[PDB]
Amino acid sequence: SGLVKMSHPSGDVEACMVQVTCGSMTLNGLWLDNTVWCPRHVMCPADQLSDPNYDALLISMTNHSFSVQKHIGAPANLRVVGHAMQGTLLKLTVDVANPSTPAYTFTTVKPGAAFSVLACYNGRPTGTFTVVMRPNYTIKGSFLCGSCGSVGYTKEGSVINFCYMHQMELANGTHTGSAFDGTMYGAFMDKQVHQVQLTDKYCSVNVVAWLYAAILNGCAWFVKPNRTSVVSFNEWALANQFTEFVGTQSVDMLAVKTGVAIEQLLYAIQQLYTGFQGKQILGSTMLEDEFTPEDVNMQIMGV
Amino acid sequence: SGLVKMSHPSGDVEACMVQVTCGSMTLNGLWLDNTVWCPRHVMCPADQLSDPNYDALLISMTNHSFSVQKHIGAPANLRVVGHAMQGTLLKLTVDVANPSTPAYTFTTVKPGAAFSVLACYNGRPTGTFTVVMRPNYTIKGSFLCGSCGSVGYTKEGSVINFCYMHQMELANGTHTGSAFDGTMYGAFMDKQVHQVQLTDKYCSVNVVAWLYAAILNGCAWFVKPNRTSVVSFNEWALANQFTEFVGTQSVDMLAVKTGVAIEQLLYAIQQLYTGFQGKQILGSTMLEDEFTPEDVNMQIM
Numbered sequence: 001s002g003l004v005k006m007s008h009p010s011g012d013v014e015a016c017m018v019q020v021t022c023g024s025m026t027l028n029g030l031w032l033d034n035t036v037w038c039p040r041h042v043m044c045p046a047d048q049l050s051d052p053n054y055d056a057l058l059i060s061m062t063n064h065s066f067s068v069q070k071h072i073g074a075p076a077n078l079r080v081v082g083h084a085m086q087g088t089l090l091k092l093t094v095d096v097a098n099p100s101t102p103a104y105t106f107t108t109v110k111p112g113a114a115f116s117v118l119a120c121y122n123g124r125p126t127g128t129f130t131v132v133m134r135p136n137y138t139i140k141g142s143f144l145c146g147s148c149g150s151v152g153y154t155k156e157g158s159v160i161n162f163c164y165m166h167q168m169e170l171a172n173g174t175h176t177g178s179a180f181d182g183t184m185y186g187a188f189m190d191k192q193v194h195q196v197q198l199t200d201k202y203c204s205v206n207v208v209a210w211l212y213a214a215i216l217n218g219c220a221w222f223v224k225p226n227r228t229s230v231v232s233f234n235e236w237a238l239a240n241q242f243t244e245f246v247g248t249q250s251v252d253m254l255a256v257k258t259g260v261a262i263e264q265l266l267y268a269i270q271q272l273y274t275g276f277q278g279k280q281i282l283g284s285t286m287l288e289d290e291f292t293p294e295d296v297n298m299q300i301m302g303v
Numbered sequence: 304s305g306l307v308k309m310s311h312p313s314g315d316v317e318a319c320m321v322q323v324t325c326g327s328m329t330l331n332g333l334w335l336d337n338t339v340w341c342p343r344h345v346m347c348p349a350d351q352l353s354d355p356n357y358d359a360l361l362i363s364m365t366n367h368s369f370s371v372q373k374h375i376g377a378p379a380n381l382r383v384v385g386h387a388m389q390g391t392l393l394k395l396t397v398d399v400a401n402p403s404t405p406a407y408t409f410t411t412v413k414p415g416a417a418f419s420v421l422a423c424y425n426g427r428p429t430g431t432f433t434v435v436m437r438p439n440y441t442i443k444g445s446f447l448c449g450s451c452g453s454v455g456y457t458k459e460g461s462v463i464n465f466c467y468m469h470q471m472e473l474a475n476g477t478h479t480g481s482a483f484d485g486t487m488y489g490a491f492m493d494k495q496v497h498q499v500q501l502t503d504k505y506c507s508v509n510v511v512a513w514l515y516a517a518i519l520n521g522c523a524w525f526v527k528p529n530r531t532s533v534v535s536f537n538e539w540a541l542a543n544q545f546t547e548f549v550g551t552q553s554v555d556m557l558a559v560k561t562g563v564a565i566e567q568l569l570y571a572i573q574q575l576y577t578g579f580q581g582k583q584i585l586g587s588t589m590l591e592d593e594f595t596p597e598d599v600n601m602q603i604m
């Protein structure tokens with residue numbers, strides 16, 4: 001198929017990762033300009049994680065409660081000169097600006113969108129992978145104890161858009177974190193209690209992109225002349241655990257390159273949801289929603 | 304499952320990528336110490352990729368025929384002061400040693416084993432992904448025009464083991480390349496003609512690891528008391544498009560943590576191959592061979 005889970009090269013972000021230690025708890029931080037970001041439950045005692053009072057924990061801290069260390073590249077112990085709490089994140093101001101700060105922005109990812117993750121333990125990057133923000137605001141990641149503060153991002157040009165800081169593993173095997181405005185994705189809360197999670201959905205726009213990728217690879221058995229309008233598909237999706245389809249220029253590019261209209265694939269999805277009739281698509285017998293229209297454009301067509 | 308396709312952080316390898324131009328052909332090179340490695344077909348004009356005489360092309364090159372440029376980090380134009388051909392690769396000697404040269408070795412990767420790929424264009428890293436070397440010595444990569452010289456590697460502690468330099472896409476969707484001794488993986492030639500692709504097979508050790516990943520996540524409906532010896536399974540495997548199983552300490556670790564014997568999962572594979580009978584394993588109805596015993600051990604400790 002030529003489609004793989006492709007992450008951004010992680011070098012620019014590796015040079016920003018630090019270890020943050022507060023008392024007995026230790027995890028990862030992101031060092032940008034004079035600021036280090038990390039999850040606020042690094043303040044919390046390991047025997048108080050269900051019902052922490054983060055406001056009281058904050059009050060009890062000083063600048064000297066925080067130990068910030070960079071082990072990668074040029075090592076350094078960074079002097080914390082200020083501390084603040086924003087939602088589920090701390091902002092630690094340090095006396096040294098990171099000389100390796102890339103051009104960056106902060107942004108929020110939406111369901112169906114993909115981003116790269118740099119998994120870190122004790123301030124050391126250990127691996128990278130890409131995930132899709134699920135419609136229930138979890139990601140299907142690979143995170144163990146000590147991974148919090150691991151960072152997710154996309155890149156536009158030379159600009160890194162940080163969009164995720166890892167916080168938590170849910171009862172199923174999935175994961176969630178905060179955007180860098182400090183709000184948790186999907187109104188989970190960063191406390192060690194059992195929380196209900198929304199039910200997931202198929203990302204319709206991503207299924208469509210994937211079927212275009214099959215067509216680009218010559219696999220078009222599911223294509224028929226029949227069509228389903230976007231309006232009627234979206235009414236259909238609400239009754240069948242799919243997100244509503246919202247067209248983008250990226251999808252339009254796939255339609256023009258293949259001669260297959262979006263509505264034909266929308267009709268195809270309604271049929272394929274009932275069953276693949278034995279046959280498979282790109283080696284799969286189920287619908288796949290982990291590739292975006294941008295991924296198909298980049299990887300198959302170099303756009 | 305806690306299972307994703309995870310590649311190594313790429314920073315160390317990003318600092319070693321360069322762009323190598325010869326004539327009107329451009330692609331990527333790997334700059335280690337004073338050597339720049341790149342695919343020899345940089346010397347070949349595009350109209351002649353079908354049957355290149357690399358002996359003659361190399362003869363007609365001079366040091367000045369090659370331009371090597373570093374775009375990432377501190378940009379630099381390196382003087383080529385020697386050029387040599389080793390199998391399907393060129394080894395260019397440049398006047399200055401890469402000051403970012405990591406600790407490294409060269410190895411060859413075996414079928415079933417996973418490695419990370421740094422995909423590059425014009426010497427600029429653009430993506431990273433992980434692959435398993437298939438039994439027919441292809442990889443299911445994502446490569447376009449201009450990606451040759453992209454590099455595959457594993458990392459042991461602080462040592463990078465370079466094992467793959469990208470060369471070509473085959474008629475099906477797959478890709479192959481060279482080891483750093485210059486030999487192509489699996490009987491291919493760096494000539495643009497259609498060539499015989501051998502048949503792929505399932506990587507049984509990887510199916511075994513995946514079944515252990517399932518057990519670890521409480522999905523053990525397929526486990527029975529029945530056993531198939533490694534010997535009997537391997538005779539069966541040659542008949543059914545499976546690699547022969549060879550145990551390792553990594554698989555043994557999974558057998559011990561779960562208490563389920565390798566020979567139980569081999570019996571399971573034989574039944575599962577005929578069909579899952581509407582059942583599911585970690586969200587699939589076909590066997591999965593893309594995750595190694597090592598992946599399962601590390602990601603699901």
Ligand SMILES: *[C@H](O)[C@H](C[C@@H]1CCNC1=O)NC(=O)[C@H](CC(C)C)NC(=O)OCc1ccccc1
Pocket residue numbers: 027041049143144145146147148149166167168169170175189190191192
């Ligand atoms: C935060 O560093 C970290 C993330 C977890 C660790 C296990 N896998 C992860 O992704 N650990 C936490 O314990 C997190 C912090 C709460 C105060 C929000 N809590 C959590 O993930 O609870 C679920 C859980 C913990 C340990 C194992 C399995 C699930």
Ligand SMILES: *[C@H](O)[C@H](C[C@@H]1CCNC1=O)NC(=O)[C@H](CC(C)C)NC(=O)OCc1ccccc1
Pocket residue numbers: 330344352446447448449450451452470471472473478492493494495
């Ligand atoms: C080197 O840049 C290139 C990588 C190919 C380009 C398309 N996708 C790839 O992975 N390798 C070649 O172009 C290779 C050169 C031979 C002398 C080894 N030829 C090749 O791969 O032909 C197949 C092909 C070419 C162009 C598009 C699709 C398939």
